[PDB]
Amino acid sequence: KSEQLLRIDDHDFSMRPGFGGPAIPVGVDVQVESLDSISEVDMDFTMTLYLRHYWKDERLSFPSTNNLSMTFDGRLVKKIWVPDMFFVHSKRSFIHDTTTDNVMLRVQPDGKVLYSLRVTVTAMCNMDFSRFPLDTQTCSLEIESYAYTEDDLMLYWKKGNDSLKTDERISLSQFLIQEFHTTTKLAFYSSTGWYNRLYINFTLRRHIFFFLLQTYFPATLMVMLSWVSFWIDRRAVPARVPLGITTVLTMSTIITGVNASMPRVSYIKAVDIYLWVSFVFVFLSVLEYAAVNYLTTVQERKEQKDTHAIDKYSRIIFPAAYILFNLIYWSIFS
Amino acid sequence: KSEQLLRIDDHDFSMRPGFGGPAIPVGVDVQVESLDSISEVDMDFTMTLYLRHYWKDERLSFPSTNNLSMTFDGRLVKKIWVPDMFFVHSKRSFIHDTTTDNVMLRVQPDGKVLYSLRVTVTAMCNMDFSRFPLDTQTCSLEIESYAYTEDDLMLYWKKGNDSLKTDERISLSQFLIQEFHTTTKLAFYSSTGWYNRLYINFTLRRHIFFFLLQTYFPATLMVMLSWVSFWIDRRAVPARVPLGITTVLTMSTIITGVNASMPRVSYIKAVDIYLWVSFVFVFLSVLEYAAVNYLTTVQERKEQKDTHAIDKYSRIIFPAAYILFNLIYWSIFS
Amino acid sequence: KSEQLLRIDDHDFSMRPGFGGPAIPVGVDVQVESLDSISEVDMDFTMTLYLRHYWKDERLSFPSTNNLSMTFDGRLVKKIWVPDMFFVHSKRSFIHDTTTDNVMLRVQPDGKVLYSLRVTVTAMCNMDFSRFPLDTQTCSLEIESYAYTEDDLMLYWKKGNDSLKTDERISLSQFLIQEFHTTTKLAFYSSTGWYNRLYINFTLRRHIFFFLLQTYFPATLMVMLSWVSFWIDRRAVPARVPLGITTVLTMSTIITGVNASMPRVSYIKAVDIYLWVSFVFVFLSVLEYAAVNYLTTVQERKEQKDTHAIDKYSRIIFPAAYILFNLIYWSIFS
Amino acid sequence: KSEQLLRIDDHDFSMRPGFGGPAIPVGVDVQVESLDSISEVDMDFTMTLYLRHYWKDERLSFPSTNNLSMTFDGRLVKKIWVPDMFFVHSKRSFIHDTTTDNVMLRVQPDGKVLYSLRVTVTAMCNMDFSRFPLDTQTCSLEIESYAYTEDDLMLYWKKGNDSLKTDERISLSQFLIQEFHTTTKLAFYSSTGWYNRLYINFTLRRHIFFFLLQTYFPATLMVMLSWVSFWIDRRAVPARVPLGITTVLTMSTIITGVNASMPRVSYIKAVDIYLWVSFVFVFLSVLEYAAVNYLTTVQERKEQKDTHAIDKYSRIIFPAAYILFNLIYWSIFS
Amino acid sequence: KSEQLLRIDDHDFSMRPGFGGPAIPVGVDVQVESLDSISEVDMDFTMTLYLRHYWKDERLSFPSTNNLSMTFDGRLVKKIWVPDMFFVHSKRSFIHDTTTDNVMLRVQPDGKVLYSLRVTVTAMCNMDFSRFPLDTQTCSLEIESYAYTEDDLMLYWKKGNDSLKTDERISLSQFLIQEFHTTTKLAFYSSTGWYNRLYINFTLRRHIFFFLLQTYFPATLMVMLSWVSFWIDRRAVPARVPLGITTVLTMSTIITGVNASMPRVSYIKAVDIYLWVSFVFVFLSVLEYAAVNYLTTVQERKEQKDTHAIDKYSRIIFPAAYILFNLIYWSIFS
Ligand SMILES: CCCCCCCCCCCC
Ligand SMILES: CCCCCCCCCCCC
Ligand SMILES: CCCCCCCCCCCC
Ligand SMILES: CCCCCCCCCCCC
Ligand SMILES: CCCCCCCCCCCC
Ligand SMILES: CCCCCCCCCC
Ligand SMILES: CCCCCCCCCC
Ligand SMILES: CCCCCCCCCC
Ligand SMILES: CCCCCCCCCC
Ligand SMILES: CCCCCCCCCC
Ligand SMILES: CCCCCCCCCC
Ligand SMILES: CCCCCCCCCC
Ligand SMILES: CCCCCCCCCC
Ligand SMILES: CCCCCCCCCC
Ligand SMILES: O=c1[nH]oc2c1CCNC2
Ligand SMILES: O=c1[nH]oc2c1CCNC2
Ligand SMILES: O=c1[nH]oc2c1CCNC2
Ligand SMILES: O=c1[nH]oc2c1CCNC2
Ligand SMILES: O=c1[nH]oc2c1CCNC2
Ligand SMILES: CCCCCCCC
Ligand SMILES: CCCCCCCC
Ligand SMILES: CCCCCCCC
Ligand SMILES: CCCCCCCC
Ligand SMILES: CCCCCCCC
Ligand SMILES: CCCCCC
Ligand SMILES: CCCCCC
Ligand SMILES: CCCCCC
Ligand SMILES: CCCCCC
Ligand SMILES: CCCCCC
Ligand SMILES: CCCCCC
Ligand SMILES: CCCCCC
Ligand SMILES: CCCCCC
Ligand SMILES: CCCCCC
Ligand SMILES: CCCCCC
Ligand SMILES: [Cl-]
């Protein structure tokens, strides 16, 4: 029996190696397999990875006439001591178990141990959509011991920045992923003490040109089209009025569609500001012709009893104001 | 063996400490980690937290030459007595178990015990949307013993208002969170008796300006635009009619979009009242020109065989009525 | 040991109390905690409640110098006999298990037993939407023994109509709940025999005014607006034609939006009938002016080589027909 | 002890009754309780039913002074032999377990056994939507032994067509259910051999009138309305042009709404063909007036330097072509 | 007892057959039952299949007077050694367990073993939608040993390309499936070594004509309709202006609907390019008439104090440019 070579019943495996003395160091390596999904409304992401641990335990040393190691499955875990790692700020996770539990244990003749498992985790990530669609987001995954303070267990990256590997075909449907790196920091709990915590960081970005073409282009085109009325004869009322009222209707339908396609985030964003400023511009264009028509009718009635100056001034004033607004807007939001 | 220092087999752990005598006090502390989501249609919220208990049991005292404590995992729970807490008015919950069960047990040499676990819970919360989007909501989470009356188990906050801690980056996508505090109250069951119950309370609010700009602005702009027709010559029927009919169409499309974006709550809200009053105003504007045109045609036919008074009165009457309505509406709903 | 006071190993708990003789009566009480959700497409509802049982078993009597009872958790259930209740016509259910199983057992010194558990269940409910939104629905939850006929187990409400309690803040987002009561009836299975079955009944209703304002109002307003054209001069073709064609477009957009907001039920309802009758009315209004214009052009051409009678008759005929239709419709559907 | 009357430890229950000899027959009966849901996109359905088995095993015979049978729960299943049935072409299933496992076992004194359980299953069903909404679908549920060939286990319906029962109130929200019946057929696996397979069949249909009124009616009405322009004076260009352009807009909005309400199936259906033919008809109507106006302007200019024949021919040609198309279409698709 | 014929307790089943010597070969066969679903947003697919293994183990040989084999259920798996296969790049999987675990074991008298199970798996698949809807996708499923390198376990297809079978009625709602085949490749892990990996490949395609008719047809028809204005008299301003403004509105509504029906992929696709080029064409058509009207008004005013050349040139220039664009576009994207 392979389990009789290790004196399982001759040791108490309820206690850590080296109990009573200096803390036992544990090394960690991580391989990211894929990103599964992201949720903007719930502000969280899902990931699948391999987790590996390294430490030494003299109690597991066995005699040998060569240098071959023994491999075990997950059934041996319950008979020995292993680190109790958990993910911080996580919402749900589980360990794969098809066709059997995805757990492996390797023991060297001198007592070195390797412990590996395959897991999926969902973690929180606070997001800010003030500068949408030009916004940038940063995420992290956290690992910590649940019951062991730094005085008993010392947690670190096995090989520094080289302990993190990522799959070559990791990608997201609506985001670009960049700048993976790792960090460490100490955490304090008033109940027990200080703990070591490991981090994995990365950054997310959007495709700008797609959003530009979908949103900014039609509004600008509609604003430019609203200016055509300034060059039509003021005596053609049945041409002048329905032009403006149909332009307002088109702008309203565009805004409603754009709202219907965006993530349901209930606070002001930059695109909304741009759209509503364009709406206000379209509205003022109709007000202008209203004034011009009333003034012309009053003058004709008074005379009874050429280009109007308002149109001549508007032809210059409206484009200049729109250009100034664009310049300020793109200086603020880059 | 660490478990041989505690006389597990020398005691009956089916019975509470102090059985037959005064009730055993139990203290509680809670740390909120994050809010996960909220559902307005189902009226419930989800939360993740740490739960901690404190009590004393002489049966667990062990001799020691120092003052060091022993730490245990979840496997020891089934061999001893622990409080049976549960969440009241909850829909679902579970305990995290990756990479192993998130449970810890600490025993002092004098028999003091600390019991901590990490859990996610979904709880009900009745909501009222009468004053939407200006409404405010209050929520609470409840904790109670399942089988032990106050005569056997006394439940309380360990440190009063200081027993509650919240994460510094707790936030919701579409809500603002404020005013966390704790309370206690007694509950009565006719089957068994009286029980102690603990509460955790907080308040929710919306972003007003976003809803204002999305909903109230376009309706007001359309109502103001409908008034332009009063200043156009009454002899331009092909300009007067299509203006009004297109304004009605635009208002209808706006209302349909606004309905399509709101949570599916099937009873009257304030925003609906505002929108339909604006719709009625637009409708009356078309009726006005209908009357004016019929009267003018009748007068011309009678004569055959200047500004009309109706327009002159409407130019003043319509804005005043709209202002009065706004004043009453914003006095009622603040 | 508390379990040594009951002679567990001295009895066979695979057989019911009183085996071989008259059936053992069992009493039931239910407390409804909340309604969780409802699904109109799948026609089912979800509920959370406490379930309690009462019976007597002499085998569990224990000697005592006082009149105190013993309390047990769910671990004792597997060592004794308990009733095997199940929910009929249910889709899914489960028992809460945080922080431990929500089960309690109380034994009196004379052998009386109380057995309580907390459960969530989803049950079917056939619905008929013919009279939507004026429809009414009735639901029920059913409880029955799985393996025991009335000759072995007699099931009844412990205290008649007083065995049912409901929470004071039970509510649904889109429904009103009323008229809770209980009933019993016998059921027959050809495989085994007759069984007792318990019922819990309640009724559901909608908010009428919300649906009225959302649906019936705009259609009526559009039908009334379509009548304006009868009072405009027949010589203004460019005003008469686009009015009607835009009214048809507005009505079509309204119908499409109303369809987009309703539950996806694929058979005819009353609201659809009302909407399509209004659509037909709008369509006939355009046909009327088409005829009037053709007749006027023919007469002018013949003469070449005042109010038309059709308009004068239509002004009276259309409103009367619409009023008659409304009267019949609201007499049929109340 | 009831389990001591059956010599459990005196027999090997790892082997089928009659091992080494002729195959043991097993009879099956099924009672359908309800249909839970259907998914057109994923093409599958869900069902809840009772499953019952019948066979004889001499090893379970026990002496008795009467003819009473013994009833067992699911805990005895693991101690004896039972058939290993499974559902073929299924996606997921489970056995109900509230308040305990829904399993029953009945043993006669001569060794006859009845084995019943309550289960929910989701199964695949390939669907074809070519003739939607006039299409018809056929479904089936399949049952088979997992490890036993016909040489060891013979599976059949206990009572032929009478072994299938259905609930009197089984219904689906958007479908009609009819023609339940059962069949059997042999299946071959190259790995092991031949197996018996049982079938349960039924048929599904839609409500035709609802779809007719929702889809076909508005398109026909719009096509008929487009013909009005043929009877208006050709000199009223501002009435003729906007009529046609608004009719095209209305038709486009109707088609978009109809697409938005239908199941997301990405291949051509009959309703789409009808809608796009109507669209083409509307488009040709505008082209006609374009030609008429250009020809009239050319003739007036040439003369400078009555009803047009095109309108007279169109008034007859368009309705005849539409009627012919309808006749062919409804002859093809019935 | 059947398990006493195999000397279970006389062997250590924690170690592979042939331990210490050459690697043990294992053969694999797969039968695909159905495809369950696909997700374009999450880029993954689901499948159900049977998995079978073949190998030889002398430790399981038993004496026999004939050549009959013994069949076992899943309860024997835990008492012997079996290969630890797992799926690479998978998101979730599970083994069916109704009415019991779907596992079978067959042992020949000489020690040959067959091991079969039924499983459902969801796997990742990176997709590229640049050429949508004309795009093509390739997918694969991967199988590998979790703890055994090629030096200990040799994995291969049992019968080459004949080891893969597919159901005759496998289909997807919105895709066509073709070209199933298998491949093998070696993989390297720096932690342990080299591993054998098996592949299953297939290809996906769309229905082109459906997308053509739904998307490309209406845009082309609207572009062609916008050209009608070039043939109308330039003196009919109230006919010329609203035509163009309504054509722009119709095009915008079409684009919004098309966007509302497509999978939410946030980057540029070919269909978007086609739609926005058509939009630009419609916009230029309105600009043309604006210029023509201004020039005519200026000339009339100057004279005060026939066909215009712009229309004559446009009638030829616009269709030629559109044809050239179509030719280039369909040469690029085939
Ligand atoms: C809530 C933070 C300030 C947001 C400012 C938005 C201003 C937009 C006004 C648009 C007017 C048309
Ligand atoms: C149901 C509680 C009273 C709601 C009152 C709403 C009144 C709105 C009328 C709108 C008329 C256009
Ligand atoms: C299917 C049961 C009869 C439904 C009758 C509906 C009649 C509505 C006709 C509407 C015509 C515009
Ligand atoms: C893909 C199978 C043939 C489908 C034929 C559809 C023809 C519809 C043409 C509609 C033209 C407006
Ligand atoms: C992002 C890769 C290049 C995409 C090029 C799209 C060009 C489309 C322009 C449409 C102008 C109306
Ligand atoms: C904001 C004013 C709305 C009414 C303006 C009507 C036009 C006035 C022209 C003098
Ligand atoms: C008619 C004079 C020129 C009109 C266009 C002016 C554009 C000004 C942009 C700064
Ligand atoms: C509510 C009345 C609808 C018909 C009114 C038509 C206009 C009348 C002008 C005198
Ligand atoms: C249902 C008839 C459709 C064509 C009617 C065109 C108007 C005719 C006026 C005499
Ligand atoms: C012009 C005569 C009165 C027009 C309105 C008549 C309404 C009739 C409703 C019964
Ligand atoms: C003006 C002559 C009759 C117009 C309608 C003809 C309908 C033909 C349908 C076959
Ligand atoms: C398909 C042709 C589109 C341009 C036609 C413009 C009308 C021509 C009238 C002679
Ligand atoms: C000369 C006609 C000018 C028409 C107005 C153009 C304003 C927008 C220019 C892009
Ligand atoms: C009026 C001269 C012909 C107009 C149509 C020309 C089409 C050119 C396509 C290359
Ligand atoms: O309850 C606790 N007191 O400290 C810790 C926990 C859980 C997470 N590890 C540190
Ligand atoms: O069934 C009961 N009778 O009292 C209680 C319960 C459950 C919740 N604790 C108090
Ligand atoms: O299979 C059965 N034969 O009778 C019954 C069942 C289940 C539900 N209880 C009565
Ligand atoms: O793997 C198999 N070889 O034959 C069968 C199976 C499963 C389903 N029963 C027949
Ligand atoms: O952790 C590992 N080191 O090598 C492997 C694993 C898992 C998958 N098998 C090969
Ligand atoms: C009218 C558009 C101006 C854009 C300027 C952008 C400056 C970075
Ligand atoms: C016309 C808007 C009036 C708003 C008044 C608000 C008073 C608090
Ligand atoms: C025109 C509406 C008539 C409503 C009558 C209602 C009778 C109960
Ligand atoms: C114009 C509709 C004709 C319908 C004919 C139907 C023949 C079965
Ligand atoms: C105007 C459409 C031209 C299509 C050409 C296609 C060449 C393969
Ligand atoms: C829209 C503003 C017009 C101002 C006329 C004096
Ligand atoms: C805003 C334009 C004013 C023009 C004054 C003549
Ligand atoms: C819309 C009301 C008009 C009243 C004319 C007297
Ligand atoms: C409602 C306006 C009435 C005007 C009377 C002259
Ligand atoms: C819409 C019907 C008109 C009838 C003219 C005689
Ligand atoms: C339907 C109206 C007919 C009028 C006859 C003069
Ligand atoms: C729409 C086709 C018109 C043909 C004129 C000759
Ligand atoms: C398609 C109609 C042609 C008419 C010829 C005079
Ligand atoms: C739309 C471009 C018009 C150019 C006139 C010179
Ligand atoms: C783009 C058309 C230009 C025409 C020049 C006469
Ligand atoms: Cl006009």
Coordinates of N, CA and C in Angstrom, one line a residue, chain B residues 16-119:
Chain B
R16 N -26.9 22.3 25.4 CA -26.2 23.6 25.5 C -25.4 23.7 26.8
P17 N -24.3 24.5 26.7 CA -23.6 24.8 28.0 C -24.6 25.4 29.0
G18 N -24.4 25.0 30.3 CA -25.2 25.5 31.3 C -26.6 25.0 31.3
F19 N -26.9 23.8 30.7 CA -28.2 23.3 30.6 C -28.8 23.1 32.0
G20 N -30.1 23.5 32.1 CA -30.8 23.4 33.3 C -30.8 24.7 34.1
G21 N -30.0 25.7 33.7 CA -29.8 26.9 34.5 C -30.1 28.1 33.7
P22 N -29.4 29.2 34.1 CA -29.7 30.5 33.3 C -29.2 30.4 31.9
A23 N -29.9 31.2 31.0 CA -29.5 31.2 29.6 C -28.1 31.7 29.4
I24 N -27.5 31.1 28.3 CA -26.1 31.4 28.0 C -26.1 32.6 27.1
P25 N -25.4 33.7 27.4 CA -25.3 34.8 26.5 C -24.4 34.5 25.3
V26 N -24.8 35.1 24.1 CA -24.0 35.0 22.9 C -23.8 36.4 22.3
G27 N -22.6 36.8 21.9 CA -22.4 38.0 21.3 C -22.1 37.9 19.8
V28 N -22.4 38.9 19.0 CA -22.4 38.9 17.6 C -21.7 40.1 17.0
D29 N -20.9 39.9 16.0 CA -20.3 41.0 15.2 C -20.4 40.7 13.8
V30 N -20.6 41.7 12.9 CA -20.8 41.6 11.5 C -19.9 42.6 10.7
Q31 N -19.3 42.1 9.7 CA -18.5 42.9 8.7 C -19.1 42.7 7.3
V32 N -19.6 43.8 6.8 CA -20.2 43.7 5.4 C -19.1 43.9 4.4
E33 N -19.0 43.0 3.4 CA -17.9 43.0 2.4 C -18.3 43.8 1.2
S34 N -19.5 43.5 0.7 CA -20.0 44.2 -0.5 C -21.5 43.9 -0.7
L35 N -22.2 44.8 -1.5 CA -23.5 44.5 -2.0 C -23.4 43.9 -3.4
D36 N -24.1 42.9 -3.6 CA -23.9 42.2 -4.9 C -24.9 42.7 -6.0
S37 N -26.1 42.8 -5.7 CA -27.1 43.3 -6.7 C -28.4 43.6 -6.0
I38 N -29.3 44.2 -6.8 CA -30.7 44.5 -6.3 C -31.6 44.3 -7.5
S39 N -32.9 43.8 -7.2 CA -33.9 43.5 -8.1 C -35.2 44.3 -7.7
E40 N -35.6 45.2 -8.6 CA -36.8 46.0 -8.3 C -38.0 45.2 -8.5
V41 N -38.1 44.4 -9.6 CA -39.3 43.7 -9.9 C -39.5 42.6 -8.8
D42 N -38.5 41.9 -8.4 CA -38.7 40.9 -7.3 C -38.6 41.4 -5.9
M43 N -38.1 42.7 -5.8 CA -37.9 43.4 -4.6 C -37.1 42.6 -3.5
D44 N -35.8 42.6 -3.8 CA -34.9 41.9 -3.0 C -33.5 42.4 -3.3
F45 N -32.5 42.1 -2.4 CA -31.1 42.5 -2.5 C -30.2 41.3 -2.0
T46 N -29.0 41.4 -2.4 CA -28.0 40.4 -2.1 C -26.8 41.0 -1.4
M47 N -26.2 40.3 -0.5 CA -25.1 40.8 0.3 C -24.2 39.7 0.7
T48 N -22.9 40.0 0.9 CA -21.8 39.1 1.4 C -21.2 39.7 2.7
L49 N -21.0 38.9 3.7 CA -20.5 39.4 5.0 C -19.8 38.3 5.7
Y50 N -19.0 38.7 6.8 CA -18.5 37.8 7.8 C -19.4 37.8 9.0
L51 N -19.6 36.6 9.6 CA -20.4 36.5 10.8 C -19.5 35.9 11.9
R52 N -19.6 36.4 13.1 CA -18.7 36.0 14.2 C -19.6 35.9 15.5
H53 N -19.2 34.9 16.3 CA -20.0 34.6 17.5 C -19.0 34.5 18.7
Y54 N -19.4 34.8 19.9 CA -18.6 34.7 21.1 C -19.4 34.1 22.2
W55 N -18.8 33.1 22.9 CA -19.4 32.6 24.1 C -18.3 31.8 24.8
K56 N -18.7 31.3 26.0 CA -17.7 30.6 26.9 C -18.3 29.2 27.2
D57 N -17.5 28.2 27.2 CA -17.9 26.8 27.5 C -16.8 26.2 28.3
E58 N -17.0 25.9 29.6 CA -16.0 25.3 30.5 C -15.6 23.9 30.0
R59 N -16.5 23.2 29.3 CA -16.2 21.8 28.9 C -15.0 21.8 27.9
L60 N -14.7 22.9 27.3 CA -13.6 23.0 26.3 C -12.3 23.4 26.9
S61 N -12.2 23.8 28.2 CA -11.0 24.2 28.8 C -10.0 23.0 28.8
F62 N -8.7 23.4 28.5 CA -7.6 22.4 28.5 C -6.4 23.0 29.2
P63 N -5.6 22.1 29.9 CA -4.4 22.6 30.6 C -3.4 23.1 29.6
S64 N -2.6 24.0 30.1 CA -1.5 24.6 29.3 C -0.5 25.3 30.2
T65 N 0.8 25.2 29.7 CA 1.9 25.9 30.4 C 2.1 27.3 29.9
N66 N 1.3 27.7 28.9 CA 1.4 29.1 28.4 C -0.1 29.5 28.1
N67 N 0.0 30.6 27.5 CA -1.4 31.2 27.2 C -1.7 31.2 25.7
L68 N -1.2 30.2 24.9 CA -1.5 30.1 23.5 C -2.8 29.4 23.3
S69 N -3.5 29.7 22.2 CA -4.8 29.2 21.8 C -4.6 28.2 20.6
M70 N -5.6 27.4 20.4 CA -5.6 26.4 19.4 C -6.7 26.8 18.3
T71 N -6.3 26.6 17.0 CA -7.2 26.9 15.9 C -7.6 25.7 15.2
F72 N -8.9 25.6 14.8 CA -9.5 24.4 14.2 C -10.2 24.8 12.9
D73 N -10.5 23.8 12.1 CA -11.2 24.1 10.9 C -12.7 23.6 11.0
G74 N -13.4 23.7 10.0 CA -14.8 23.3 10.0 C -15.1 21.8 10.4
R75 N -14.1 21.0 10.3 CA -14.4 19.6 10.7 C -14.7 19.3 12.1
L76 N -14.2 20.2 13.0 CA -14.5 20.1 14.4 C -15.9 20.5 14.8
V77 N -16.6 21.3 14.0 CA -17.9 21.8 14.3 C -18.9 20.7 14.7
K78 N -18.9 19.6 13.9 CA -19.8 18.6 14.1 C -19.6 17.8 15.4
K79 N -18.5 18.0 16.1 CA -18.2 17.3 17.3 C -18.5 18.0 18.6
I80 N -19.0 19.3 18.5 CA -19.3 20.1 19.6 C -20.6 20.9 19.4
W81 N -20.9 21.7 20.4 CA -22.1 22.5 20.3 C -21.8 23.9 19.8
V82 N -22.7 24.4 18.9 CA -22.6 25.8 18.4 C -24.0 26.4 18.2
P83 N -24.1 27.7 18.2 CA -25.4 28.4 18.1 C -26.0 28.1 16.7
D84 N -27.3 28.0 16.6 CA -28.0 27.7 15.3 C -28.7 29.0 14.8
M85 N -27.8 29.9 14.2 CA -28.4 31.2 13.7 C -28.9 31.0 12.3
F86 N -29.9 31.8 12.0 CA -30.5 31.8 10.6 C -31.0 33.2 10.3
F87 N -31.1 33.4 9.0 CA -31.6 34.7 8.5 C -33.1 34.7 8.2
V88 N -33.8 35.7 8.8 CA -35.3 35.8 8.7 C -35.6 36.5 7.5
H89 N -36.7 36.1 6.8 CA -37.2 36.7 5.6 C -36.2 36.6 4.4
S90 N -35.5 35.5 4.4 CA -34.5 35.4 3.3 C -35.0 34.4 2.3
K91 N -34.5 34.5 1.1 CA -34.9 33.7 -0.1 C -33.9 32.6 -0.4
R92 N -32.6 32.8 -0.2 CA -31.6 31.9 -0.5 C -30.3 32.3 0.2
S93 N -29.4 31.4 0.5 CA -28.1 31.7 1.1 C -27.2 30.4 1.0
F94 N -25.9 30.6 1.1 CA -25.0 29.5 1.1 C -23.6 30.0 1.7
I95 N -22.8 29.0 2.1 CA -21.5 29.2 2.7 C -20.4 28.9 1.7
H96 N -19.4 29.8 1.5 CA -18.3 29.6 0.6 C -17.5 28.4 1.0
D97 N -17.0 27.6 0.0 CA -16.3 26.4 0.2 C -15.1 26.2 -0.7
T98 N -14.4 27.3 -1.1 CA -13.2 27.2 -2.0 C -12.1 28.0 -1.3
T99 N -10.9 27.4 -1.2 CA -10.6 26.1 -1.7 C -11.2 25.0 -0.7
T100 N -11.5 25.4 0.5 CA -12.2 24.6 1.5 C -13.2 25.4 2.2
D101 N -13.9 24.8 3.2 CA -15.0 25.5 3.8 C -14.4 26.7 4.6
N102 N -15.1 27.9 4.4 CA -14.6 29.1 5.0 C -15.1 29.2 6.4
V103 N -14.5 28.4 7.3 CA -15.0 28.3 8.7 C -13.7 28.3 9.6
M104 N -13.8 29.0 10.7 CA -12.6 29.0 11.6 C -13.1 28.9 13.1
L105 N -12.4 28.2 13.9 CA -12.7 28.1 15.3 C -11.5 28.3 16.2
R106 N -11.6 29.1 17.2 CA -10.5 29.5 18.1 C -10.9 29.2 19.5
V107 N -10.1 28.5 20.3 CA -10.4 28.1 21.6 C -9.3 28.7 22.6
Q108 N -9.7 29.4 23.6 CA -8.7 29.9 24.6 C -8.5 28.8 25.6
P109 N -7.4 28.9 26.4 CA -7.2 27.8 27.4 C -8.3 27.8 28.5
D110 N -9.0 28.9 28.7 CA -10.0 29.0 29.7 C -11.4 28.6 29.2
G111 N -11.5 28.3 27.9 CA -12.7 27.8 27.3 C -13.5 28.9 26.5
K112 N -12.9 30.0 26.2 CA -13.6 31.0 25.4 C -13.5 30.6 23.9
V113 N -14.5 30.8 23.1 CA -14.6 30.3 21.8 C -14.9 31.5 20.8
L114 N -14.3 31.5 19.6 CA -14.6 32.4 18.5 C -15.0 31.6 17.3
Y115 N -16.1 31.9 16.7 CA -16.7 31.1 15.6 C -17.0 32.0 14.4
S116 N -16.3 31.9 13.3 CA -16.5 32.8 12.2 C -16.7 32.1 10.9
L117 N -17.5 32.7 10.0 CA -17.8 32.1 8.7 C -18.2 33.2 7.7
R118 N -18.1 32.9 6.4 CA -18.3 33.8 5.4 C -19.5 33.3 4.5
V119 N -20.5 34.2 4.3 CA -21.8 33.7 3.8 C -22.3 34.8 2.8

